[PDB]
Amino acid sequence: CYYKI
Amino acid sequence: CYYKI
Amino acid sequence: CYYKI
Amino acid sequence: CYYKI
Amino acid sequence: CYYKI
Amino acid sequence: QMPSLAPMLEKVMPSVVSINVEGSTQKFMALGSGVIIDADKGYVVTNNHVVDNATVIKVQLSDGRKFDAKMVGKDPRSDIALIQIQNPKNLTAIKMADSDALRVGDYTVAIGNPFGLGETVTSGIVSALGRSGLNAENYENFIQTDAAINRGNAGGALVNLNGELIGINTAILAPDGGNIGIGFAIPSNMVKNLTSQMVEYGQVKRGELGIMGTELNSELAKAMKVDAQRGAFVSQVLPNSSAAKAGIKAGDVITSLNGKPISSFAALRAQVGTMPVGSKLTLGLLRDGKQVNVNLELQQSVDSSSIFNGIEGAEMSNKGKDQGVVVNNVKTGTPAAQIGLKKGDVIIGANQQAVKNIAELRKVLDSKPSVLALNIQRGDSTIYLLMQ
Amino acid sequence: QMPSLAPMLEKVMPSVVSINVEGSTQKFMALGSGVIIDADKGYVVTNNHVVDNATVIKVQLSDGRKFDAKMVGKDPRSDIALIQIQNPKNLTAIKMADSDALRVGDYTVAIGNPFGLGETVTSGIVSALGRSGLNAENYENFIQTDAAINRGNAGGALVNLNGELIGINTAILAPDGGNIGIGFAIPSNMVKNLTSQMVEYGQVKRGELGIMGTELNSELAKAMKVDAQRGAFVSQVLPNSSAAKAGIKAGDVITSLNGKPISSFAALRAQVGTMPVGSKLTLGLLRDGKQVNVNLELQQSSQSSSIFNGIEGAEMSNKGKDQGVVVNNVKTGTPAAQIGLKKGDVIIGANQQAVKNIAELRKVLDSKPSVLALNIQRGDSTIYLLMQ
Amino acid sequence: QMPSLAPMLEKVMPSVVSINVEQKFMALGSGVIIDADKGYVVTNNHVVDNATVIKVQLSDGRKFDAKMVGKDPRSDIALIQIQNPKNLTAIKMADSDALRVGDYTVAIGNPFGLGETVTSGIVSALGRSGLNAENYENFIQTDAAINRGNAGGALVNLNGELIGINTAILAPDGGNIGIGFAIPSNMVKNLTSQMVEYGQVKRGELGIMGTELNSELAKAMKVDAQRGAFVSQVLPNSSAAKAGIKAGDVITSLNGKPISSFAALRAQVGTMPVGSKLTLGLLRDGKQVNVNLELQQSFNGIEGAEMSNKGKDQGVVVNNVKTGTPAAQIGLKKGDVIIGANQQAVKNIAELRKVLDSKPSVLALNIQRGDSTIYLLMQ
């Protein structure tokens, strides 16, 4: 799914 | 005998 | 099928 | 055994 | 582990 | 300053692709590797045991571009298939060197896709050459390499330190399914000869010379008081064969082909099991301690399972000039004799249409009817047979 | 006069240690390997899973000298630990290399202690770069090798031909637990950025850029008419983020990191997911099919065995301005619910001595008495907790 | 212009063989030619042990019949001899003491009876032992591919010189995982050169007990080195007792070459022939000590009784009697005098021997104990 940085 | 990848 | 030595 | 060609 | 030589 | 393999692989890895296959049998999906042979046309060679029974085939390059590929040819006796990429745009082909120049000791670079991880390059050497016996009916003249090869490397390229294709990784020996340093690749010359046959005709013109024989061990050369301890031993020659036309006596030993020494009969059988009908070649022989050289040319060469798939033990063919499919011989307890096919039956018709030969028969077979009704005849009697 | 690795190895073999650890959870024993980064201070880097739940850590050198090592910093998100040797006496550390210059096909050498056999050296090649997906939440930008790696190589060194460390052997893909020719190691730059943070802070300054993304596949590439078939796909940018200040719009595709092309988004998350807070970097974007560069600067993200060392499942930090040791969130069944801890608990005191922060908190953890009394609060309620 | 091992290998591969040996069983392994003329092939003992039939297949295919020469299962080395050798190719042996971790290796053998298979690797490590605490083990470890059937094969360096004999792999599954062990060539030299000259392995001992040296013992005994041999105790009348090796000493080197561990040191001299003079590097009380030594064994002394002649042809007087010996079963005691045996008088050890050379089923000895004249019986 979506990821974050 | 042998295996087949 | 995985191994963390 | 035997084989043809 | 007390072998002889 | 360090030595490396990176500059060679940066020109070669775009050539190797990962393949994905969807099938049905219990539906299945398979993954493996492939090698771009022709750049413009989109020919990608792979293992036949990779792409059989495949409904959908998508090929992914090294950079991640997806394509759709169509089967073109298959040859399971040697386990080489060929697919063609749809709408080929910007691909890289691999130069194929002569595999007959390989020697035990040369360094090898194996490229493939184990476990869908991605393009994986591994290093090894030529462990041995001319190996066969995994499936004694197959045409296998395998290269042996300790290059790391696991599930998914199949259809991947085996290259020398120059990046030229020297073999297509095929199978490994693993009592645990994981690589223990034993990989097998079909030589590039067998692939070069089998890829060039699927380009012209879509299948293989399996040519036969016409000599029977078996392996030459060390014991038989002591009995035949022959010098060489390995080669092809001619047990007999078939009459009316081009090989018999050339002057080949039984009891002779074959030692070379096109000058190349012969590792084994099963290797020689596999080498020529790929060349098309009519290939001129030279042979080195040893009959009575004398060297004999001769040139040759192939001639052309039937189960009920060669017409049905699953129905063995009933050898059939055409009869006369469009007079039905005659049953030549039937073995007891075989998938045809369980339904009623006896030896001598003349298949006259099926499902209210006449059957004159193996061709008119296959006009309604491929029409796939639910239940089938043959109108064969046991001599003077007219009987019917049912299937499915 | 034969080529060999022995001249290089005799320089580097002292730098690699084996690590023996005893702990409890139910007492157990296990072992991995470590690498000396600073021979003066006694810094040995290893895998965090080698040193997880560790009461006593012993390091044994190449020559057999036994030492003692205390923990420094751990980072289980990337499985990098760092320990310091008690009494550093005449060591030799390894120099490192820039993994961003690594190429697939370069030769590699693995050094570790497989099965407690002692320092074992094994050779291979770079199989692939940017490998990930083996644990989605972890920051993994692995290197792949066909060099032999087994149990005990964990934390060991992976060096090039000049003897420079390029990676730390972490884990293998072995269906049976034995190396099938596929090993993974954490790149050097990742270990350098993480260790150099652990020397100053004993922790990882986890900075964020403020972007949402997913992996750019060939299918999505066609969806957005984007030429690059791999990279980062920007889904949204957060307000007040450096990424917003840099002017990044959603739908942009990231292709390069400081020039270095991106193998995947997962590699990108691990790359800058290790760079310390404030690290200025540039990016290669791609909006409307037009290449765009941008300069950036990481900012803060603001987030128990980090402090407890063995009793985990619950993250905890300081509270407000001198408000004590708050508990952020707890997982069930872990050693945190074994003592009576929930989310929102604020450790204000311990053994009649107040606790204003984690530095005042561990200021009593140092005392190590027989019995602990945690003066926590839940809501306006003040309670105590007893352990050991 | 590419590199390759093929030139080196096409010189060496004729020198490595495959072996076929046959609750009846059939077995397969490998061997390496030591002598071109005599047809001597070295191989692992666990390949040709309990062998009724031994068929050797060369690199070209030529089969041969071989029979046993020597065996020593404590080191897992066995020597066979090809019967009626014709045009055989010996291998050139190198001194394994020149080996170094990181040198490239090449292993040759017959994995799963496939035929001669060549595999590459490096020296993973050296001096490894412990996999059978009672076997003589000083293995070269290598990452070269080695599986079931590679036993008895050749591990050679890049010049083709034989550095070791592939023996066993460390594998939880029975398939190579990059850990293979090979007995060093120098042990093969000392062992096979004994099986030819003596038929078996003349084992010598120094008469010292000892345990390994850990970093924990180095502290307690004020010793500097962290690995070696700790002399616990020396047996009296042993070479070390004679040589003046005292207890609590530490063996650092052997003949100049330093020692990696006691278990390696035990395996080295376990292959040296009896009487092999040598020198040791000791370390006692912080003083470097060198010592020379001479192995030993573990008139006509028959069955544990030392005897020599008495008087002028007055028979053979027994001189010592070890208890719990064949001599103790016969009852003979020290000081006993023989006059005759089996109705034949005995004057010296020659006349005794010519009745022992006659090898009878029972032995009746006409001795005299003290003042009495008695008979003793044997066999």
Chains that touch F (3 or more CB pairs under 8 A): B, D, G, H
At G181, phi and psi to the nearest 5? 95, 20
Q: Which residues of F touch B5 (CB under 8 A)?
A: 32, 149-154, 169-172
Q: Which residues of G touch F177 (CB under 8 A)?
A: 175
Task: Answer yes or no: do H5 and F105 touch at CB < 8 A.
Answer: yes
CB atoms closer than 10 angstroms to residue G124:
24
CB H316 within 8 A of CB H345: no
Judge contact between G377 and G344, C-beta under 8 A.
no
Strand partners, H104: H122
Beta bridge partners of F121: F111
Beta bridge partners of G208: G299
Residue H328 in 3-state DSSP?
Answer: helix
Cβ contact, residue pair G114, H179, below 8 Å: yes
- Strands of F201-289, DSSP E: 211-215, 232-237, 253-257, 260-261, 281-287
**For an interface test with D, which of F135, F137, F141, F212 has the most D Cβ atoms less than 10 Å from its Cβ?**
F212
- Which of chain H's residues have a Cβ under 8 Å away from the Cβ of F131? 114-115
CA torsion angle F207 F209 F211 F216 (round to 10): -80
Identify each DSSP E strand in G15-96 by its residue range: 16-24, 27-38, 43-46, 54-60, 66-75, 80-86
- C-alpha F132/C-alpha F318 separation (Å) is 36
The full length of chain H comes to: 379
* Token pair in block for residue F64: 């991640």
* Distances, alpha carbon G36 to alpha carbons F134, G40, G44, G82, G256, in Å: 48, 10, 4, 10, 32
Which is it for the CA torsion F97, F98, F101, F105, positive or negative? Answer: positive
d(CA F149, CA F119): 12
Report the C-alpha gap between G336 and G315 in whole angstroms.
Answer: 10
Most A CBs within 10 A among G135, G206, G212, G233, hence the mutation to make, goes to G212
Task: List the structure tokens of F255.
Answer: 């030692």
Which residues in G lie closer than 8 A to residue C3 (C-beta atoms)?
Answer: 151, 171-174, 177
- Rounded distance, CA H185 to CA H32, Å? 11
Burial class (CB in 10 A: 0-12, 13-18, 19+), H339: middle
CB contact at 8 A, H117 and H110: yes
Using CA coordinates, name the residue in chain F closest to G127: F121
Q: E strands along F205-321, which residues? A: 211-215, 232-237, 253-257, 260-261, 281-287, 290-296, 314-318
A with G: touching (≥3 Cβ pairs within 8 Å): yes
For chain A, the chains sharing at least 3 beta-carbon pairs closer than 8 angstroms are G
Q: Which residues contact G236 (CB under 8 A, 6 or more apart)?
A: G211, G212, G250
From chain H, which residues contact E within 8 Å (Cβ)? Answer: 133-134, 205-206, 208-212, 232, 262-263, 265-266, 269-270
CA F35 to CA F83: how far, in whole Å?
10
CA proximity to H377, closest of H341, H353, H335, H352: H341
| Cβ neighbours of G10 in H, within 8 Å | 100-102
Beta bridge partners of G46: G81
Euclidean distance between CA atoms F230 and G203, whole angstroms: 69
Quote the minimal CA–CA distance from G296 to chain C in Å.
35
- Tell me if there are at least 3 CB pairs under 8 Å linking chains A and F: no
Cβ–Cβ of E1/H265 closer than 8 Å?
no
Residue carrying the six token digits 């010098």: F227
Cα(first)–Cα(last) distance of chain C, in Å?
A: 13
The C-alpha atoms of residue H76 and residue H138 are separated, in whole angstroms, by 12
Q: Which of H217, H289, H286 is nearest to H253 (CA)?
A: H289
Phi, psi angles (nearest 5°) of residue G244: -70, -45
| Cα-based angle F278, F284, F286 (whole degrees, multiple of 5) | 130
**At what resolution in Å was this solved?**
3.6
> What is the distance between the terminal CA atoms of chain F, rounded to a whole angstrom?
71
Return d(Cα F277, Cα F299) in angstroms, integer: 6
Q: Are H107 and H2 in contact (CB under 8 A)?
A: no
Q: Could you give the count of Cα atoms lying within 13 Å of G291 in the half-sphere of its Cβ?
A: 6
Rounded to 10 deg, the angle between the F265-272 and F188-200 helix axes is: 30
Judging by DSSP bridges, how do beta strands H229-234 and H162-169 pair with one another? unpaired
Closest to F103 in 3D by CA, of F144, F155, F154, F133: F144
Q: Is F191 exposed, middle or buried (0-12, 13-18, 19+ CB in 10 A)?
A: buried
Tokens of G208: 């964020």
Whether residues G214 and A3 touch (CB distance < 8 A) is answered with yes
Helices H / strands E in chain H, number of each: 8, 24
Could you tell me which residues come within 8 angstroms of residue F305 by beta carbon, excluding any fewer than 6 positions away? F311, F312, F335
H or E element at residue F246: helix F242-246
**Cross-chain Cβ contact H103/G64 below 8 Å:** no
Report chain C residues whose CB lies below 8 A from the CB of G47: 4
* Interface contact F180-G180, CB threshold 8 A: yes
Give the DSSP letter of residue G278: T
Q: Pick the closest to residue F335 from F315, F318, F360, F361 (CA basis).
A: F315
- At position G127, the amino acid (one-letter code) is S
Residues F223, F214: Cα–Cα separation, whole Å: 15
Tell me how far apart the alpha carbons of residues G260 and G231 are, in angstroms, rounded to a whole number. 12
Structure token pair of residue H247: 């207890």
Q: F33-36: which pairs have CB atoms within 8 A and are 24 or more residues apart?
A: F33/F111, F33/F112, F33/F113, F33/F152, F33/F153, F33/F154, F33/F155, F33/F156, F33/F157, F33/F169, F34/F59, F34/F83, F34/F155, F34/F156, F35/F94, F35/F155, F35/F156, F35/F157, F35/F165, F35/F168, F36/F91, F36/F92, F36/F93, F36/F94
- CB-based touch B/F (3+ pairs, under 8 A): yes
3-state secondary structure (DSSP) of residue F241:
coil
DSSP secondary structure string for all residues of H84-140: S--S--PPPB--GGG--TTBEEEEEE-GGGS--EEEEEEEEEEEE--TTTTS---EE
Candidates F5, F20, F123, F146: best to mutate against G (most CBs of G within 10 A) is: F123
Q: How far is CA H64 from the centre of its chain?
A: 27
Tokens 């070890």 identify what position? Answer: H322
Give residues after which chain H gaps, C-N over 2.5 angstroms: 22, 298
| SS3 call for H264 | helix
* Residue H203 C-alpha from the chain's centroid: 7
Do residues H131 and H168 lie in contact, with contact meaning Cβ atoms separated by under 8 Å? yes
Containing H/E element for H292? strand H287-294
Contact, F223 vs F314, CB < 8 A? no
Residue type, F46: T
Helix (H, G, I), strand (E, B) or coil at F238: coil
Count of CB contacts below 8 A, B vs F?
Answer: 30
Pick from G211, G119, G199, G195: nearest CA to G156 = G119
Question: Closest by alpha carbon to G120, among G151, G93, G79?
Answer: G151
Question: Under a CB-based contact definition with an 8 Å cutoff, are residues H63 and F219 in contact?
Answer: yes
Give H142-161 as a DSSP string. E-S---TT-TT-EEE-TT--
In single-letter form, the type of residue at position F199 comes to V
Angle at F40 between CA F38 and CA F46, to 5 degrees: 35
How far apart CA H193 and CA H183 sit, in angstroms, is 15
Residues of C in contact with G151 (CB under 8 A): 3, 5
The DSSP code for H343 is T
Helix (H) or strand (E) holding H8: helix H6-12
Contact G50, G32 (CB under 8 A): yes
Chain F positions in Cβ-Cβ contact with residue H111 (cut-off 8 Å): 182
